Amino acid sequence: PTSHHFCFSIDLRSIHALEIGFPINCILRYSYPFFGSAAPIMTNPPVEVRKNMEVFLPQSYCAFDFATMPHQLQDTFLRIPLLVELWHKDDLLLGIARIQLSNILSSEKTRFLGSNGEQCWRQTYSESVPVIANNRIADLSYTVTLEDYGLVKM
């Protein structure tokens, strides 16, 4: 009776490599089971990334439709960072970026037409965060969006 219908999306738009020692065939990979248990979601195909160049990742957008109580979503986003692993495929795990999904909850929440054709309250947030080996080997630019469709329909 108090659960809401939400749609969340993440777009790992680009990676600007800095101090990875060598050119890599790159894929970014992540899981966030609070939206539903699943094998890791990955960008695809692997793309070449070389020192000091910004590369846009293919298949980098995913949306997630789920129902939960607003406090559960707020607590999970506050407590559990989304960890995005940067892998070199051939495979080596080069680094991880820790994204604090609660940053979007501090964004202005306004009434929008939602992606499903129904009204919603919408928030969005974009930033760049470092991908940590130990050292900072790359920067990941991303955007997240949260649609709140209100109480689950009867």
PDB experimental method: X-ray
- The span from the CA of 78 to the CA of 151, in Å, is 22
* H or E segment to which residue 84 belongs: strand 82-88
Residue with token string 């979503």: 73
Resolution in A for the shown PDB structure? 1.6
The residues, ordered by sequence, that sit 6+ positions from 104 with a Cβ below 8 Å of its Cβ are: 77, 123, 124, 125, 144, 145, 146
The continuous run of DSSP H or E covering 6 comes out as strand 4-17
